[PDB]
Design an enzyme around this catalytic site. Structure first.
Site, short mmCIF file in Angstrom:
data_model
loop_
_atom_site.label_atom_id
_atom_site.label_comp_id
_atom_site.label_asym_id
_atom_site.label_seq_id
_atom_site.Cartn_x
_atom_site.Cartn_y
_atom_site.Cartn_z
N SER A 72 15.06 -35.32 44.39
CA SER A 72 14.95 -36.36 43.33
C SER A 72 15.25 -37.71 43.99
O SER A 72 14.53 -38.08 44.90
CB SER A 72 15.90 -36.00 42.17
OG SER A 72 15.86 -36.93 41.09
N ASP A 122 10.86 -32.86 45.04
CA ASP A 122 10.68 -33.31 43.65
C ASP A 122 11.12 -34.77 43.59
O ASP A 122 12.03 -35.15 42.77
CB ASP A 122 11.49 -32.38 42.75
CG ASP A 122 10.86 -31.97 41.43
OD1 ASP A 122 9.60 -32.00 41.33
OD2 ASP A 122 11.66 -31.58 40.51
N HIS A 125 13.01 -29.45 37.44
CA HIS A 125 13.67 -30.39 38.39
C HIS A 125 14.89 -29.73 39.04
O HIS A 125 15.06 -29.87 40.27
CB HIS A 125 14.11 -31.66 37.67
CG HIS A 125 14.37 -32.82 38.57
ND1 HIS A 125 13.46 -33.23 39.54
CD2 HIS A 125 15.39 -33.71 38.60
CE1 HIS A 125 13.92 -34.31 40.14
NE2 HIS A 125 15.09 -34.64 39.57
#
EC number: 3.1.1.47
Length: 369
Positions: free
Chosen positions: A220, A243, A298
């Protein structure tokens, strides 16, 4: 509520290095291949203030902070706390960058798998206030007395996000390069006083690093870190962005990334604006690859995917359709493939080269956006 063990041949050790003691020094957890495999298992979230930080991050009340503590405070991860480093080889090094609301210890599924395959993994703890909580010491006397000073997650107004997210991912890149330098300086003998008094002696890491074989990995905000980091420091030979959240990156970095780069995405997190930025990084002269894990969310990359049961997990979005073990094995085996390919590892990981292309029932080549 069990984080999966390292599928690879090496017994995995774990410890914490902080140095220097300050707001400005490097704080990381190491996962390394260990000599002996019979030390105590490592405390998964090893202080109260993290649970309080996670509450402030999730947006729970003063309460759930201690709930989360009650349910998780005594959870371990399958790494041999403070075990001696396994001697007799120069191991490749990964620097790992946590996501927003994370901290150094929440990516142990990935650290332990990489170490059990021969990697040393330094998982940094960012002090850009992107972590739920971190800590440092004010002065020497403080570190000497154990007098912790806690920095908690910063919440931002609509009007701050663009600018401060960018300053934060730059500070994250700086932090990854500082951790790399601390580890390489230790590898070559620079003497270091760990600001945490721990049973692991840091003279052990002397001639333990293969200094040509370095990668940056991150979930992330950690994926934006990877990209920014690769931009600033070519010592990082390739990057894996799990991600990625591309919002913090300025338009300037998409030009400025020589090293190979691998986007491993969850099915249910990604979106057009974000995917359009990943695509900006592509160029016919540079190796970019991108797979999407099918059924994943996620959080399937962090260790909270493993800290609850089926129905509770899907309830809080820590679990998707796919099994959690299937998804981290795919993520991890494709990772090991990309690392061998582009670090030049003398290993069996190229058996998973088909995953880098997304040839598996549970992988989508590229993206579903």
């Amino acid at each position: 509520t069990k984080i999966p063990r390292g599928n690879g041949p090496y017994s995995v050790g774990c410890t914490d290095l902080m140095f220097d003691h300050t707001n400005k020094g490097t704080f990381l957890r190491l996962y390394y291949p260990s000599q002996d495999n019979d030390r105590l298992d490592t405390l998964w979230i090893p202080n109260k203030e993290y649970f309080w930080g996670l509450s402030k991050f999730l947006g729970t009340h003063w309460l759930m902070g201690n709930i989360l503590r009650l349910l998780f405070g005594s959870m371990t991860t399958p790494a041999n706390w403070n075990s001696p480093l396994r001697p007799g080889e120069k191991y490749p090094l990964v620097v790992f960058s946590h996501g927003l609301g994370a901290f150094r210890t929440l990516y142990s599924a990935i650290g332990i798998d990489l170490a059990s395959h021969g990697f040393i993994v330094a998982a940094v703890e960012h002090r850009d206030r992107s972590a739920s909580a971190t800590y440092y010491f004010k002065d020497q006397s403080a570190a000497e007395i154990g007098d912790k000073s806690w920095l908690y997650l910063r919440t931002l107004k609509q009007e701050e996000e663009t600018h401060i997210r960018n300053e934060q991912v730059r500070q994250r890149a700086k932090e990854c390069s500082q951790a790399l330098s601390l580890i390489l300086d230790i590898d070559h003998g620079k003497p270091v006083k760990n600001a945490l008094d721990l049973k692991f002696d840091m003279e052990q890491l002397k001639d333990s690093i293969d200094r040509e074989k370095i990668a940056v990995i991150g979930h992330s905000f950690g994926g934006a870190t990877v990209i920014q980091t690769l931009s600033e420091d070519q010592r990082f030979r390739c990057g894996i962005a799990l991600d990625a959240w591309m919002f913090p990156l300025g338009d300037e970095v998409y030009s400025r990334i020589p090293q190979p780069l691998f986007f491993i995405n969850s099915e249910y997190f990604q979106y057009p604006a974000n995917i359009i930025k990943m695509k900006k990084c592509y160029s016919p002269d540079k190796e970019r690859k991108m797979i999407t894990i099918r059924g994943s969310v996620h959080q399937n990359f962090a260790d909270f995917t493993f800290a609850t049961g089926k129905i509770i997990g899907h309830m809080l979005k820590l679990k998707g359709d796919i099994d959690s073990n299937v998804a981290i094995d795919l993520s991890n085996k494709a990772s090991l493939a990309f690392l061998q390919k582009h670090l030049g590892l003398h290993k069996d990981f190229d058996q998973w080269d088909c995953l880098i292309e997304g040839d598996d029932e549970n992988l989508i080549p590229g993206t579903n956006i």
